[PDB]
Amino acid sequence: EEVAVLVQRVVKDITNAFRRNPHIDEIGLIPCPEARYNRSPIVLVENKLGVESWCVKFLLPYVHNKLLLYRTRKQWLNRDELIDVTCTLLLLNPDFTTAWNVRKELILSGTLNPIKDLHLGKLALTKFPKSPETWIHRRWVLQQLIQETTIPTERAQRLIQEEMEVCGEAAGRYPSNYNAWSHRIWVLQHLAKLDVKILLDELSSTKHWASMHVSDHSGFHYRQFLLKSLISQTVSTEEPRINLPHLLEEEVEFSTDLIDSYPGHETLWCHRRHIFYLQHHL
Amino acid sequence: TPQKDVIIKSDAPDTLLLEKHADYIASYGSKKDDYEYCMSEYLRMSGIYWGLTVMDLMGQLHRMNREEILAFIKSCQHECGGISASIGHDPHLLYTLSAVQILTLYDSINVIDVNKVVEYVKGLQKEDGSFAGDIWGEIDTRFSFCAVATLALLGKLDAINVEKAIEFVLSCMNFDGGFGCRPGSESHAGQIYCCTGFLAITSQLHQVNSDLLGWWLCERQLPSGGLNGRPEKLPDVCYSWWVLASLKIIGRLHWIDREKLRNFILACQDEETGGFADRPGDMVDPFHTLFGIAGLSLLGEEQIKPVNPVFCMPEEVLQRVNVQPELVS
Amino acid sequence: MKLYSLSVLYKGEAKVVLLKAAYDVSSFSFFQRSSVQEFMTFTSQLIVERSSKGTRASVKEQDYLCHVYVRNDSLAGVVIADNEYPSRVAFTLLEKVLDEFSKQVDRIDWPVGSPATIHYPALDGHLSRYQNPREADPMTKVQAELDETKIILHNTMESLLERGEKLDDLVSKSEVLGTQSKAFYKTARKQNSCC
Ligand SMILES: *C/C=C(\C)CC/C=C(\C)CC/C=C(\C)CCC=C(C)C
Ligand SMILES: *C/C=C(\C)CC/C=C(\C)CCC=C(C)C
């Protein structure tokens, strides 16, 4: 029908939307029953990218089927075309593993720049902040940025801090976002190598976040992880030794100060309960 | 403020609608919706498995097109031996397990190159005994389970480094007794199912503190009767499988509150359409429909076939293949 | 710990009147903020339409918690928060506003009030301050005679409606909700995650 050209126009509208505006915060769905005359469903307001709902029922299966044809070698696509379709495909359904795998091959072949995928996933995590495959792909991309060939490099800390931001924002959009906090932990293990400095900075900054999300056991587990990792590293940067029993008593105080303020939340109960385990085993 | 939990209404279902559930799964996908198909095709193979198993548990597997599915599965096998979620998609250990599970239900594992499947799974194990989802190296305890679950149904458990595989899973056990996706992860009822299922297959349940872990699992039950996966999470019917199956494996199922949980599961039915939602009054789907039925079967629902807590399949099916792991007495 | 809505109404004999409201739809997705704000307006009015004079109640929904205070002089005040936010601090905020509301606005402007006619710019000031209860004023005079624990609780907002009263017929019929907001409720596309 006319859908063949109405949709193929959109995949360029989205691609051109990124060239026009590099600083796009989030993507979103705009409630729209039917198409507006000669108006693209791709609406760019401020730093926000909107997609009118009427086109989604047409846009997705077009791009979806196009990638599968490429994967099965039923239809050839330019590497520029391949990037464009996978991009619009993953903004609609980031759980589509194969599309991510295709981009992996592009990155590994040298066609695609790894940073472009980080920013892509970052946008996808605004509409789908809990999408498992997105976090999975992120780990592969990050792992490729270390295999390029002690405190990690300056560029590494730039990436790590970037991971702390997206894991935090994704934790704010969905309550008890397991996959988000699990990724944040994974970063500190492989990207930061349990750096004593970063562990402390993470412990300090997230203390306020925990007070504003008391029912988020995933966030409080991150607290437990930070503390548990500090014990492993300590067996200036030598002060956490005397501070180790002090941080644990500060944490149990901070938790008690929340249970007395906000009773009922079993997370706070479970958190303190877990902190007790740390103090008893030293 | 009250605890975060659902409130079961009086007009909510309290009777097992076994027939309407069979009709729901049977008429699923009948509507020509291209959008919904594409959206969920990335896990379609697992979707088939959920659909067929819940029908077999109700003894209505015959209502499903055996031949059409068996063709689909044979098309989803690749050169590397792995099975993808659907035709065209990339192979993955998840849908490799789902495919084998389906072929086992239909007693036709020969439709697929069994030897290649074993090779694919074996080539996913790392040096530390962990398992990856595919060739891209994503590590998860789910994959450790999917590996041995696939091989056990093929009678090829000794193909992989069993001793080293067990070594890794035990390194994912947290102090609370639970398991995560990776070492140092937050305990998750779903991840616990995989690990307890793993250790059941590899015969290492003696490495599990049944009292401690069973305690953690029983803490998932809320005043409504429903179960969740983690502390302060809304009750979910799918977790009435992940939690119960773990309990049955470690031998602590009797600790749970039978009737209250049963009334929760039944309350998540749809009197009009059929199938189970995650909570009473929500949209239903084949996923929650299976684990709702499977949960009731574990609780002792006599209208439903006894389900194996490890492989999530009818016991009679796993009796034929001589694969029934010894559980904790 | 979040505050979504904070409005002051007047329960008349014929209809319920919106006088002044404050919103904070920043936590929501951008292109849905317009619709969400309208629902919180539609909700707050519907609560008062089912609330008797001189009673306190807390209507609970999934991941959302509404707190209503309808005084004896039919001056209603509704605050909408999440499940984390304590009800005691919610009713405390409702009381300190309704008292300072009669101080600045006369009682004769209540039955014919309007968001453009009523002069009360102290709502956004309080809504943003009472976000974190550990930063709010410690009014012990209010909380002393506040809670008799007679706060009626509701599992859903269906408990307020009649026996055969469908909520869907209250959404698509409302003149408060926009045409895209009515669709937003029907085309809610019920949540999917954990599949
Ligand atoms: C909300 C629940 C989710 C997202 C899934 C929780 C379950 C998990 C994490 C375990 C996954 C288990 C797998 C993939 C094994 C295959 C499943 C069965 C054999 C039932
Ligand atoms: C979690 C998402 C679900 C359950 C939707 C996808 C379901 C399928 C795919 C199952 C369809 C196949 C049959 C009913 C045989």
Phi and psi, residue B114, nearest 5°: -65, -40
| Cβ A92 vs Cβ A59: under 8 Å | yes
Residues C123 and C146: their CA atoms lie apart, in Å, by 21
The answer to whether the CB of B242 is under 6 A from ligand 1 is: yes
From A169, A11, A173, select the one nearest A90 (Cα to Cα): A11
Phi and psi, residue A30, nearest 5°: -105, 120
What's B185's DSSP letter? P
SS (H, E, C) A139-156: HHHHHHCCCCCCCCCHHH
- Burial of A234 from C-beta contacts in 10 A (0-12 / 13-18 / 19+): middle
Q: Enumerate the domain spans of chain C.
A: 3-183
Token representation of residue A232: 């492993």
Residues A104 and A100: their CA atoms lie apart, in Å, by 6
Residues A256 and A254: their CA atoms lie apart, in Å, by 6
Most distant CA atoms of chain C, gap in Å:
55
What's B43's DSSP letter? G
In the CATH hierarchy, which fold is given to the domain comprising A2-281? 1.25.40
Residues C49 and C39: their CA atoms lie apart, in Å, by 15
Q: By CA distance, what is A26's nearest residue in C?
A: C30
Phi and psi, residue A48, nearest 5°: -105, 140
Query: After what residue numbers is chain C broken, C–N > 2.5 angstroms?
Result: none
Residues C128 and C135: their CA atoms lie apart, in Å, by 11
Residues A191 and A184: their CA atoms lie apart, in Å, by 10
Shortest Cα–Cα distance, B3 to chain A (Å): 6
Top mutation candidate among B37, B45, B48 for ligand 2, by most atoms within 8 Å of CB: B48
Token representation of residue B200: 């059941």
Residue nearest to atom 13 of ligand 1 (CA): B142
Phi and psi, residue C137, nearest 5°: -65, 145
CA end-to-end distance (rounded Å), chain B: 41
**How many domains are there within chain B?**
1
**Which residues are within 8 A (CB) of A155 and not within 5 positions of it... i.e. 6 or more apart?**
none
Phi and psi, residue B73, nearest 5°: -65, -40
Residues C112 and C117: their CA atoms lie apart, in Å, by 9
Q: Cβ separation of B38 and A266 shorter than 8 Å?
A: no
The answer to whether the CB of C194 is under 6 A from ligand 2 is: no
Q: Cβ separation of C155 and B9 shorter than 8 Å?
A: yes
Neighbours of A232 (CB within 10 A): 10
Which residues make beta-bridge pairs with C56? C69
Neighbours of chain B (3+ CB pairs under 8 A): A, C
- Burial of A80 from C-beta contacts in 10 A (0-12 / 13-18 / 19+): exposed
Q: Does A30 touch chain B (CB under 8 A)?
A: no
Top mutation candidate among B142, B288, B289 for ligand 1, by most atoms within 8 Å of CB: B142
Selected residue of A36, A212, A260 to mutate for chain C interface (largest C Cβ count, 10 A):
A212
Phi and psi, residue C164, nearest 5°: -110, 25
**Which residues are within 8 A (CB) of B8 and not within 5 positions of it... i.e. 6 or more apart?**
B224, B225, B263, B264, B267, B280
Shortest Cα–Cα distance, A96 to chain B (Å): 5
CA end-to-end distance (rounded Å), chain C: 28
C-alpha distances in Å from residue B321, one per residue of A111, B101, B107, B109, C172: 48, 11, 9, 11, 56
Residue among B1, B84, B231 whose CB faces A264 most closely: B1
Q: By CA distance, what is A105's nearest residue in B?
A: B136
How far is residue B291 CA from its own chain's centroid? 8
The answer to whether the CB of B291 is under 6 A from ligand 1 is: no
H helices of A29-113, where? Answer: 53-71, 79-90, 97-109
C153 in helix, strand or coil? strand
CA dihedral defined by B148, B152, B154, B155, rounded to 10 degrees? 120
What's B124's DSSP letter? T
| Cβ A12 vs Cβ A59: under 8 Å | no
Residues B16 and C176: their CA atoms lie apart, in Å, by 41
Neighbours of B302 (CB within 10 A): 8
Q: Does B270 touch chain C (CB under 8 A)?
A: no
Residue nearest to atom 8 of ligand 2 (CA): B47
The answer to whether the CB of B42 is under 6 A from ligand 2 is: no
Phi and psi, residue A28, nearest 5°: -155, 165
The answer to whether the CB of B61 is under 6 A from ligand 2 is: no
Which residues make beta-bridge pairs with C68? C57, C78
What's B77's DSSP letter? B
Please report the sign of the dihedral spanned by the C-alpha atoms of residue A24, residue A27, residue A33, residue A34.
positive
How far is residue B122 CA from its own chain's centroid? 22
Residue among B1, B7, B279 whose CB faces C87 most closely: B1
Residues C9 and A212: their CA atoms lie apart, in Å, by 29
Domain with residue B270: its CATH number is 1.50.10.20
From A82, A88, A76, select the one nearest A16 (Cα to Cα): A88
Token representation of residue C138: 């410690």
Residues B133 and B292: their CA atoms lie apart, in Å, by 27
Neighbours of C195 (CB within 10 A): 16
Count Cα atoms within 13 angstroms, Cβ side, for C179: 2
The answer to whether the CB of B47 is under 6 A from ligand 2 is: yes
Count Cα atoms within 13 angstroms, Cβ side, for A200: 15
Token representation of residue C52: 């008797």
A229 in helix, strand or coil? helix
Residues B247 and B186: their CA atoms lie apart, in Å, by 19
Chain A contacts of B133, Cβ < 8 Å?
A: 136
C-alpha distances in Å from residue B28, one per residue of B21, B23, B290: 11, 8, 13
Ligand with an atom nearest the CA of residue B101: 1
| Cβ A204 vs Cβ A242: under 8 Å | no
| Cβ B46 vs Cβ B72: under 8 Å | no
From A35, A17, B151, select the one nearest B143 (Cα to Cα): B151
The answer to whether the CB of B244 is under 6 A from ligand 1 is: no
Q: Are strands B313-314 and B307-308 parallel, antiparallel or unpaired?
A: antiparallel
C-alpha distances in Å from residue C143, one per residue of A28, A261, C95, C134, C147: 42, 15, 9, 16, 7
Method: X-ray
Residue among C65, C86, C194 whose CB faces B278 most closely: C194
Helices and strands per DSSP (H, E), number in chain C: 6, 6
Token representation of residue B304: 């439903």
Q: Output the DSSP codes for B256-323.
A: S-HHHHHHHHHHTB-TTT-SB-SSTTS---HHHHHHHHHHHHHHT-TTSPPEETTTTEEHHHHHHTT-
Angle CA A184–A189–A192, to nearest 5: 90
Q: Does domain C3-183 have CATH number 1.10.3720.10?
A: no
Q: Enumerate the domain spans of chain A.
A: 2-281
Q: Which residues of A touch C (CB under 8 A)?
A: 25-26, 28-33, 48, 50, 53, 126-127, 130, 172, 175, 211-215, 261-262, 265
Q: Does C117 touch chain A (CB under 8 A)?
A: no
Please report the sign of the dihedral spanned by the C-alpha atoms of residue A107, residue A94, residue A226, residue A211.
positive
User: Is B312 marked within a binding site?
Assistant: no
Residue among C62, C87, C195 whose CB faces B285 most closely: C195
Phi and psi, residue C93, nearest 5°: -70, -35
Q: Cβ separation of A140 and B176 shorter than 8 Å?
A: no
Structure's resolution in angstroms: 2.9
B156 CA to centre of ligand 2 in angstroms: 29
Phi and psi, residue C135, nearest 5°: -130, -5
H helices of A110-177, where? Answer: 114-127, 132-144, 154-173
Residues C118 and C101: their CA atoms lie apart, in Å, by 10
**Which residues are within 8 A (CB) of A254 and not within 5 positions of it... i.e. 6 or more apart?**
A207, A210, A211
Residue nearest to atom 18 of ligand 1 (CA): B312
The answer to whether the CB of B24 is under 6 A from ligand 2 is: no
B199 in helix, strand or coil? helix
